[PDB]
Each structure stands twice: as C-alpha cells, then as structure tokens.
Amino acid sequence: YVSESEPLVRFKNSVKITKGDLNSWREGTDPCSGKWFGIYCQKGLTVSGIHVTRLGLSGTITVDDLKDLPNLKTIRLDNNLLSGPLPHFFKLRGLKSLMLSNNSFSGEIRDDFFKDMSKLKRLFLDHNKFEGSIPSSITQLPQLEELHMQSNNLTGEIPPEFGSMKNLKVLDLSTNSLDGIVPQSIADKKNLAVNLTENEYLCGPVVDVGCENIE
Amino acid sequence: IGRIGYCFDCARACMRRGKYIRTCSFERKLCRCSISDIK
C-alpha cells in the first residue's frame, strides 16, 4: 500500500549506503509495485519483507520507523557494514524472521532484548562481534525454530532453557568461546540439530567431553 | 617440558581410560578426554 511508502522512505534516510542505492524507494508510490529494490509483499498488496543486502550500510542504524509497517514479518540486512549494538528490533512485534548475518554489531545483548518479540521463528545473529553471554530472552521465544549465533565472541554457559524450547530445530552456536558444561536438557531434546563445535572449553553431553582435567 | 609433548601425554593418558582425547592446552595444564568410549 502507498501509505507504507512513508515509513520505508524515512528508514532509507536513517542509513548510510556505500554500495549501490535505494533511489527506487520513491515517496508516494506503492512499495508493492515491484519496482522497489529489496521489498517483498504479501499477496502483492502489503509490505511483508525487507531485504537490504550487500549495500555497504555502515555505521549505526535505527529501525524505529519500521514499526509503522503492520505486516512487516521479515528483515534481512545480511552482508553489510553495520556496527553498534542491536537497534530497537523489539518494537517490530510481528517480526517472524530477523537476519543480521555478516555485520559488525557488537557488545553483549541485554538479557531481556527479545522479550517483546514473541513471533520470531528464525534468528540469525551469526558472523558479528557480539560478546558476553547469550541473552536469556532468546530462550523464551515460544515460536523459535532456528537460532544461528555462530562466529561471534560469545562466552559463558549455554542456558539449559534451550532444551525446553518446543519448536527449536536448529541451534548453531559454533566458533564462539562458550564455557562450562553443556546442559543435559540440550542433549536430551528430540530431533534437534545442534552445533557447539569450536568452543574450546565447553564440556559434557553434546560436545562429548568429560569435564575433569586429568592433569 | 614442552607443548606438543604435553598433548601426546594427554592422548596417552586418555587412551589408558578407554577414551578419545578431546581438549588439550599446555599453558592451562588442561587435558580433557571424551565421555564416550572408543569405537
């Protein structure tokens, strides 16, 4: 719908593009025309996905404008140069898929970051520079099917809540520096594809490692 | 003393417990074996 061109255009001005551009995002035109780079629409009527990939978006981003897209369900900002901590994605309540792979987002994500994002099914935070612990709110996402957080600078234990995530099918936390012992609940979980490799100090059930140093 | 030498001794230490070697660092004096037994 044409009204949906307003928030997108505002968003377009809130980012620094260094490869290609978004000149096809013309204010006053329906972003569902087919002419807007990177827009997916549901039934060709209302904006439901935004894909601004490989545009060299750099610096900080703000996403607040995007809360005015009622049917926004997927955002993909893969392969840019974004840095800073996570913007206010939690204001996008209906979001089903959030993809941030291959940027330089940083810091430790505050534990309650995801609390307001109850519709998330897929979450890709991989190949960034996140540090500290895995936020506990990720484990409380009732719809989460896939989580990829591989290739960050994460430390600390993996929360056992992961084992009691009804819909979780893919959990990739490889190549971090996650610590301590792997919760049994995680190994117990039915048909879960997990990858905890390249976390040197992890021990226990999934990595198949006795915790006892025999030296 | 030595680093790679340490991991070989870790490997052996693990083998005399029917376990595969898993984790080794000389600086941390940590040698860890698998929980599972050799197949």
Residue numbers in the entry:
A (entry chain B): 26 to 240
B (entry chain C): 13 to 51
What did the publication describing this PDB structure actually write?
In order to probe the recognition mechanism of AtLURE1 peptides by AtPRK6 at atomic level, we solved the crystal structures of the AtLURE1.2-AtPRK6LRR complex crystallized in two different forms by molecular replacement. The AtLURE1.2-AtPRK6LRR protein complexes in the two crystal forms display a nearly identical structure. As predicted, the structure of AtPRK6LRR contains six LRRs that create a slightly twisted solenoid structure. The N-terminal segment (residues 20–52) of AtLURE1.2 is completely disordered, whereas its C-terminal portion (residues 53–89) adopts a typical structure of plant defensin peptides characterized by cysteine-stabilized αβ-motif (CSαβ). The C-terminal loop of AtPRK6LRR is mainly responsible for its interaction with AtLURE1.2. The loop of AtPRK6LRR binds to a positively charged groove diagonally across one side of AtLURE1.2, whereas the C-terminal extension of the last LRR packs against the outer side of the antiparallel β-sheet of AtLURE1.2. AtPRK6LRR-AtLURE1.2 interactions are both shape-complementary and charge-complementary, resulting in a total burial surface of ~1226 Å2. Interaction between AtLURE1.2 and AtPRK6LRR is mediated by a combination of polar and hydrophobic contacts. Arg83 of AtLURE1.2 is located at the center of the AtLURE1.2-AtPRK6LRR interface by being sandwiched between the C-terminal loop and C-terminal extension of the last LRR of AtPRK6LRR, forming hydrogen bonds with the carboxyl oxygen atoms of Tyr227 and Cys237 of AtPRK6LRR. An extensive network of polar interactions is formed between Asp234 of AtPRK6LRR and its neighboring residues Arg73, Ile86, and Ser87 from AtLURE1.2, suggesting that this AtPRK6 residue has an important role in recognition of AtLURE1.2.
Orthologs of LURE1 in Torenia concolor (TcCRP1)15 and A. thaliana (AtLURE1)9 were recently shown as key attractant molecules, indicating a significant role played by these secreted proteins in pollen tube guidance. By contrast, our data showed that the LRR-RK PRK6 expressed at the tip of pollen tube is an essential receptor of the same attractant peptide and important for targeting of pollen tube to ovule in the pistil. In the current study, we present biochemical, structural and functional evidence showing that AtPRK6 functioned as a receptor of AtLURE1, strongly supporting previous genetic data. Sharply contrasting with other LRR-RKs, AtPRK6 recognizes AtLURE1.2 through the C-terminal loop of its LRR domain rather than the LRR portion.
